[PDB]
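Risk mitigation, structural track. In case the binding assays with protoporphyrin IX containing FE fail to produce interpretable data, a predicted complex structure has been prepared as a fallback.
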Amino acid sequence: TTPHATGSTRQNGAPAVSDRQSLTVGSEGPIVLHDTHLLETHQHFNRMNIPERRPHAKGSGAFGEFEVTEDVSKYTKALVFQPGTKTETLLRFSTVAGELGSPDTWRDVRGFALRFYTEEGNYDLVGNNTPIFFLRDPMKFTHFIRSQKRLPDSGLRDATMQWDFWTNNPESAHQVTYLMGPRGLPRTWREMNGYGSHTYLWVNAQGEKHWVKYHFISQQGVHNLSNDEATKIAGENADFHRQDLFESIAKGDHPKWDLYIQAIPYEEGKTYRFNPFDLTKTISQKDYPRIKVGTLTLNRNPKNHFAQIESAAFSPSNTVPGIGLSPDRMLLGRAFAYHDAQLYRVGAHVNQLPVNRPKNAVHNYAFEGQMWYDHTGDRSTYVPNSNGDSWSDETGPVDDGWEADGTLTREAQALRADDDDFGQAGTLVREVFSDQERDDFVETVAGALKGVRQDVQARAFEYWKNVDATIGQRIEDEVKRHEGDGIPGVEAGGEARI
Amino acid sequence: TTPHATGSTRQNGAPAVSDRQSLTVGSEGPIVLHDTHLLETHQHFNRMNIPERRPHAKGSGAFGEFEVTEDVSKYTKALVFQPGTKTETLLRFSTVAGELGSPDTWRDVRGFALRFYTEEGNYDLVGNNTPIFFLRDPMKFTHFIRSQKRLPDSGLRDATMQWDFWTNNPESAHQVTYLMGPRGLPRTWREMNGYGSHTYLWVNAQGEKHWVKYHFISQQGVHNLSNDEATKIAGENADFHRQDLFESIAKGDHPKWDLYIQAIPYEEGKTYRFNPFDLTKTISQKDYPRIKVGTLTLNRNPKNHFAQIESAAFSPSNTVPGIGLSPDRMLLGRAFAYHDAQLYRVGAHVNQLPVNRPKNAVHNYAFEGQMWYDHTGDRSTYVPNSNGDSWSDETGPVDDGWEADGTLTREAQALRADDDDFGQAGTLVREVFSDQERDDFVETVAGALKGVRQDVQARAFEYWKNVDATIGQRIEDEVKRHEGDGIPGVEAGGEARI
Amino acid sequence: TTPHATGSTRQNGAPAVSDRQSLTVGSEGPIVLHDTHLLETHQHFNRMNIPERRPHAKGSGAFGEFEVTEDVSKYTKALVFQPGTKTETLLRFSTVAGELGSPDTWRDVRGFALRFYTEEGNYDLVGNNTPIFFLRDPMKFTHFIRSQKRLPDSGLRDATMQWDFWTNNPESAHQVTYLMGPRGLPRTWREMNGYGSHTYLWVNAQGEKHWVKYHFISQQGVHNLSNDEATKIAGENADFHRQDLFESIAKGDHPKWDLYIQAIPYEEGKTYRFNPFDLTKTISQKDYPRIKVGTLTLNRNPKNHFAQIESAAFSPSNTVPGIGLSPDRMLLGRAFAYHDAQLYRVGAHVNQLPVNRPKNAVHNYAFEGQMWYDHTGDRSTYVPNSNGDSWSDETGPVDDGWEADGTLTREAQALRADDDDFGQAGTLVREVFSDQERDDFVETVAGALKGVRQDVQARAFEYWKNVDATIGQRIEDEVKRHEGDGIPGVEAGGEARI
Amino acid sequence: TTPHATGSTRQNGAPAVSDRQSLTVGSEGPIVLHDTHLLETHQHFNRMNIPERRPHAKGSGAFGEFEVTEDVSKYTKALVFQPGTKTETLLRFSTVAGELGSPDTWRDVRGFALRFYTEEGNYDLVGNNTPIFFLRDPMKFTHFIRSQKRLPDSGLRDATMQWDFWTNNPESAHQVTYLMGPRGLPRTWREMNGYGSHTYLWVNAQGEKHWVKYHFISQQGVHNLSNDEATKIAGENADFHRQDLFESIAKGDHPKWDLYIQAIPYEEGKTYRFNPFDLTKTISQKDYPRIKVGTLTLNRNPKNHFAQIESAAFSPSNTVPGIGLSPDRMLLGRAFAYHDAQLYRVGAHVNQLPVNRPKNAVHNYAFEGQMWYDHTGDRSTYVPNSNGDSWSDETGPVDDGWEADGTLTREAQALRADDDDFGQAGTLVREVFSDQERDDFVETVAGALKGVRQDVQARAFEYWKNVDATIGQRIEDEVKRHEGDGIPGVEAGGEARI
Ligand code: HEM
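Fallback model:
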C-alpha cells in the first residue's frame, strides 16, 4: 500500500482512481481524451485476442511428469530417456478443424502435444491420437486442412468438399478409415491413446542409429462415444473434454499413459516391406514389437489457461541430442512450419515466454526484436570473436543424419514390396474391427456421405470398395437409401454448400 | 496461358510446377530449402488467421438496399435519408460472447451492424437486437465482456462469474431481463428486430437538432426458440443462423425490416423524465411515437465470406453530415474503440479494403504505413500548403455538438425524475410479458442460477425481487428446489468453476 | 555444460552444432529444409528491426539519480519530490526529424525524456531542449512533423516544404526563432538545458493546486556549434552526441542538471497576461521566479542499447499522485498518442519489459494478449467481484482536475491581454540575443531560405519582419543576394524538390 | 464536391470539418474523446513507419526498360530474354549497413536490385555492385551483418568488431579487397557496375543447361570518390546519391547499363578450376568470355517513394521458366530469406501491392490473411477438386534441377584445383589495380585499422600479407606509424568501443 493507493493501478503503477467510471466534464458531460485509464484498459482489451492456431485451435492441457522405468540406453543417448530419469512435462490436447469456440465432441483427429523439459533442452513430441496421417507429402497439407474447414462463400463446413479432397487423394484411405471408426470420437482425452505417428531417429552414445515409433497407451483404456451421443454433448457442453480434464486433475484422478517404442535397425529401414518414412503406414508389431520405456502422469492444472496453454508453442524441430528427424517428408515440412507460425501467432520472442523457456541455459545467436524480455547485455553478436563469447563449430557428418542421392524432383515416394494406398485400411476393417464396429462404421460413413454431390459420392463408392469390397457395397447400399448417422460437426447439401 | 504454364502460379506469377509434391533429392531424399512454392504456400497458410473480433466474433451477413419512403427532411440533412433515396447496404449479424467456432444458438445478445454506402461517406449504424444495454459507462464494458467469457484458469464459461458481475452492477437489470426473456434466443436473424439502442443526434439543413432513436422492425416477425430447442440445434448445427441467412437469400426469400425513428426536440432531451443519454433506458412511445422512414431489404450473399464479412470493419465513428453522436457515455467510448481494434485486427489500412472503402472520393491526410494499396502520389503532406492540395478549416461551434459545463469528475450520471435501475425491467416483466412468457422466464432465470455459488445466488434473489417481488420469489423458490432449464452456452458449478 | 554441448544452443536450449556451416547433402549438395538452426537464426534476424520512433528516432541515453535538496512539499504531495528523496532515473536524448541512422548534429530540436522510477509508479517528464514548441493544437502536429521529413516523390528533405508550413502557421514564430538561434545546434547533450515546456498541475496534500513549469539547467553550461562545424561533424562522426555521452560516463564525468520550477497559483492561471496553456508562450521569471527543487545526475551507461534505450517507452500519461496534466491542448493530445504508438512500435505488453516496469506492485485490469510474460494467474477479470481481488472506485471530482464550460467547437484559444504570435520571438531577437548572435541568426535564416520557391520566400520575409523589422530586412537583403550559411540536414531547390 | 464538403474527408469519406483545430468544450476546454478525426489521423501517423530493411535500409530507385538486342535463345527459354523483347523494369539501389537516415556516401557495398515485369511473372535479379561476396555459407551471414552494424552497449559502429569478424573468416578476403579498393565509394549509382554475383542456371527450350553469370556494365563508366570527398559529402548532403538519380532522370539524362553473361556448359561447372558455386570466386573471362544480351535504361522516377520503392519487395526466389538457382549455398539461403523478411516488414499480402504484382494473371493457392485486397471469390481452396479450378501437378525431375549425393553434413565446400581464400584477392591487388590505386588502398586499409584493438590488428597484418606480401608490409608499416585515411561511416577505439 502506497500512501495514495486506490485499490488498483494503471500500467505505470500509479493509482487508477476508478475501474468503474470514466472522466467527464461534470456528471452530464463528455468523456475527455485524457482519461488515460480508459484508454489503456480499452486498448489492451482490443489486443487480447491473438490468432488461433491453424490447425488445432480448440484444446486444453495440463502439466505432469514422465518417469523412465526401463533401460533403453542401448538405443538412445538422450538424457530424458536414460535409466531412472524423471522429467517435468506439459501436454496439450486438441481437435484439428474447429475454431476456438467449437465443440470438443466433433468427429475429428485429436492432437497429443507433449513437451519434456529436459536438462539438455525442451524436447517436444508433437503427436496425434492416431499412428498415421492422411498424407505423405507436406505440399498437400494446406489443401487438406482448408478442405476440412469452410467454404469460401457461405462460411460453412461441407462434406462434399471433404470427400472431394479425400477421394482425389487416395493416400488418405488408411487414416480416413481410422477417423470413421470408433476412435473418431474419444469419450475423454484421458481415454485415448497418443502416438508420435512418424518414424524418428534415435542415436546412442556410440553413434549407432535406430528408427523409432512412439506409442502412448492409456492406462484408462480407449473409450469412445457414438455419433448421437457426441452430437448431444456438443449442444449441452461444448467444452466437455476441457472440463473433464480439469475436474479430473482437481479431484486427484491423475491420468497415465505408458510409453512404448518400436525400434528398427538403421539398415532395415531402407528395405522393410512397408515404407517407414510414409506417414500413411503402420509398422507391424509382429516384425518389430513394442518395447516399454516408462510412464507419463498428468497431475497439475494450469494456473492461467491463456499464458500456459494458449501461448504454448510446440515444435517437432525441438529435438535434443540422441533424437532426430527422419526422411519422412511430412516430418521435414513440420520442422519448418511450427516455428514460422508461432512467430506470427505469438511473436518473435515466443520462446522467452515462461512456458516455452528451457530449464537449461540458453546461449543463442539471436538479438533484438520486439518484446525482448531477457537481453544479452554486451555479449558479442558475431562469431568467431576474440571476446570469449562461445560458439559452435562442429564439422562433418552430423550424428542424426542419413544419406541421399538423386536429382531434384517432384514425385511420389517409391513403393516398397507391400506398399499401396488401401491394404492397411482393409486390414483394419476386416481383421481389427469387430462385427459391431463394422456395423457402426457403415452407418458413420453412409451418414458422412448423405447429401454429398452425386459425382463425388460415386467416387467415394469406388474408394470404399478399394478398401474392402463387402464394406464398400454395404456403404453404397445405405447411401442409395439415404440412410446413415448424423455426424457431429459437419453435413452436406443445400443451397449454401456444393 | 503462357507458353510454360502448368495450371497454377507462385505469388510472382511464374508457373508453380506442382501443388501436390515437394522438391526432394531423388524420390527418397530430403526436401530442399529452395522449394519456394512449398515455402510461400505454407507461410501464407500460417498467416491466414487474424484475431477474431472481441466481442461479436461469431457472425455472418449479406448485402442489400435501403429505400427511403417517407419525408424526414425536416429532421436531418443527411443524404442517405432524403426523400426517395436508395442506398446499398451491408449487414453483419452476430452473437457477442462466443468465439469464431461457437454455436449460433447460444443464449446471448445479437449484433445488428449496418453500413450504408452513401454519397457523402460510409454511414455505419452499429446496433444490437435490443434497444438497451447492460451498462451506462464504458469503463465497465471491458469487465462485463470478460465476465461473459472464460475463467482464467480452466478456460470455461461460468454462470457464477456472470451473476457476480450482474448483481454487483444493478444498472444491468433492464437488459438482463430482456436477455432472459423470449428474445434471448432468436429463431433466425430474419426473425428479430434491430435497434440503434443509443440516442443519436440529427441535424437539419437549418441547423435545428433532434435526439433520435432507431428501430428496425422485422417484416418476418419476432420468433424465438426455447432453451431446449436451442441446445439441440447447437449440437446438430452450430452454424444454423449463418446457414439460414445464406440459404434464404439464395432461394430468393429476401428479408426486410422497416426503419422507424423516435424524435425528441433538442431541449426536451435535457428535461425528459428518463435520461435519453442513459443506455439502460427506453423512451416511451406514448411520449415520442415512432415515425416511419423506409425499408431495408437484404438480397445478395457474399462472394467471399472472409474478405467481405470477416474483414468488414464497422464503427459508430462513421457518421455523415446530418447525423452525430450524443452525450451518451457509452456511445462516446465506442467512437474511439472500434477503429482502434481494427488497426490491430485487420491493419492500419483497413479502410482501403474494398468492403470498407466509401463510394465517394477520399481526400484524407494519412500517408504511408504497411500495406498501402492506394497511394497519394505527390500530394502535399501538410496544411496549409501553397501547392493547391485542399484541406478543411471550418472554425467555431460544430453542427453536431452540444453544451457542457462542470469540473472533471468520475461519477454516475444524475438521475432524472423517473430514473432508477429496476423500474423499466419491472414494467417489462409485469406489463409486457404474457403469463406464458413469465412462466418461461422463471424457468430460464432459475436454470441460469443452478450451481451458482450460494453467496452470489443470494444477491441474485434480492436483485430479482427488486425487479418484481412476485417473479423474484418464484425464481428463489425454484432455485431452492434445484429446478430450472439448461441454458445453451453456459453452466455453473463443479471443480473447474467458481 | 551439458554432456553433448557444442558451444551454443538453439532456442529450445539444445546444442546448436554449428554457428558457421549449413546442413547440406554432402559437401557439394543443397541445403535441406530441416536446418532448423539456420531457420531460427535467419527468421530472428529478419525480425530484429522494429519501427523507429516517429518523431525522435535518433537518440541515446543513460541511467542516473535525482536528489531532492529543497522543500517543495507545500506545492505537491508527489512522493518523488518530497524532502530528501532520491530516485533512480532514465534519460533519453534525441533529435526530432531524422531517422535511425541520421547524423546527430543536424539543426533540430532535441528531446529530453526523463523517467523517475518512483515508489508510486513511473513518472515520465517527456521534455525538450526548449521551453516552447511550434504549435498550440495537436491536430497540426502530424502536418508539422511530415513537413520536417521528406517529400513524397523524391524522398528528400526540403526547406521549401518546411517554410511553407511555418509561414502558414504563424504560431510557430517563437520556436522557429529559438531553433534558428544558437541553441539549434547543441555541442553535446551535456551542454544543453531541458524543459518540460508545458504547464503541468501540482496538487498538495491539502488539495491546493498550482500550475508549474519545469526547467533543467545544465551544470555544464549551454554550448553550441556553428552551422559549419556541425556540418563537418555530421560527415566525420554521425554519432557524435551518442559517443560523447557514453564516453563521458565511462570516464567518470557525470553530467548534472538542476531542476527549478515556476509555480503559478491556480486562479492566476486563468487571468495571467500570457496564456500558460499555450505551448508557444513562456512565462516571465519576473512575474513567477524559478524555485529550486534538486539535482539530476547521469552516472550509468546502458548494458544493452536496444533493450534499455530503443525499447524504452516514455509517456506524458505516466503521471503519479500529486502531478497532473493541464488544459494545454497539446499536452492532452500527448496523453493519448505515446501509448498508442508504443503498442505498434513495441507491442501490447510494452510496459512489462524490464526498463518500462515500475518498482512498485502493478495491480491492473489487463489480461492476455501477445507476449504476456507476467501473467495474473487466477485473479478475477471483472469488478466488483466477490473473490477478494481489489479494484478502484473513487467517486466525484478528481484531485488533478479543473473546470470547463462551453459548446463543442473547433477554434483557436482566446487571447490573453499580451498574447500574439510574434511578440515573444521579438523579445528573444532584440533583448536576449547578443549582437554576435543576431549576426549569426541572420546568416542561418538566410541560409535556410536559399533556394526556397520565391512565393514562399516572400511570405517568409513578411514573417520575419513581423518578428522584428530590422532583423527581417537584414534577412531579406541577404536572401536577395543569395548569401547565407549551409544548414546541416536540409537544403532547397533543384529538380527533386519543390 | 458533395453538398456538405469542407475540403477534405475522414477515412470513411465524410467531411473532416477541420485539419487544423481539435474538438474542445469551448475554446478553453479539454479535447473530447470523440474527436474522431484527431484520433484517425494520429493513429495513422503512429503507424506510418515500417521496419527498415535489414540489410540495405538506405536506398532509392527508378523505373525503366530492358531491351534484348542479341540472340541468346540457345541458352535460355525465358521470355524476358528472347530476341527483340522489351520489358518494363524497376531498380532499387542501396548501401548495406546503414539505417534509413544514414548518409549515402559511407564506404560500403551497394545493392543493385532489378525487377523485370515479364509476361510469365516478375523476374528479380537481386544483385550488388560487386561480382563476389564476403561469405560462402548463409549461416555466417547473420553474424557478418551484425558485425557491420552496432555494438550492443554503446550503439556505435566499430572497426574492431568488423576486423575481428573478417580476420576470423578468411573467405572474406576477396570481397574485403574489392570494398577497400576504389569501388568502395561510387561517385553516383549511375557510375557503378551491377552484378548478379552468383552463378544461376539457364535452361533452353530443349532442356539443355548452362551455368551463367550476369554483368551489368555502366555506359556512364565507373567513377569513384576518395575517402575525404565522401566524408565531406556525408556531412553536406546525406542523400547525395538519391538526389543525383532523381535529378538526372528529371532532366532527361537516362542512365544505361549493358548486360553481358558468361555461359558455362553444365558439366564444366562441376570440373572448373575455380568453384562457380563459391560466391567468393570470379570466373575468368579468358576461359568464359562475356556475351552481350541487351541494354537497361532507367527513365522514370517514382510518383511515391514509399509506395513504390520502400514497399517494393525483391526476392531471388522470383525466378521465371528458363532461369533457376544453382548449388551456391548462399543463393539457396536467399531463396528462403527475402520472402520471410517481407512478411514481417510489409505484410502477408506484400505481393498484392501494385509495385509487387505481376503483369500476368496470378492463380495461386493462398487465401485469407490480413489486408487481403484481391480476393478469390468462390474458387476452390483445395486440389484436386471437381469444380474446374485448375492446379499444377507436373511429376518427375524439374527442368531447373541438378544432382546431389552424400550424407547430411556441416562442412566447407570441397576445393577445386585453384581454390583458396587469398589468390583472387592477390590478383586484384597486383595485376588489376594501378600504382595509384595501390597507394590509395594502403591508406584506406591502414585508416580502417586505426584504433583497432592490437590483437585484432596483428591478425589483420597476417591477413593482408596472405593477400600480398608487399602490400601487407606497407599496410603494417603505416598502421604502426598511426597513419591512414579517415573512413566514411566508421572508426575504432575509445571508451565506447572494443
Ligand atoms: C462502450 C461500449 C462498447 C464498446 C467499447 C464496444 C466495443 C466493441 C469492439 C471493440 C468491437 C469489435 C470491433 C471490430 O473488431 O471490428 C465491437 C463489436 C460490435 N459491437 Fe460494440 N462495444 C460497445 C457497445 C456496443 C453496443 C451498445 C452495441 C449495440 C448498440 C454494440 C454493437 C456491436 C456490434 C453489432 C459489433 C459487431 C460489429 C460487426 O459485426 O463487425 N456495441 N464492439
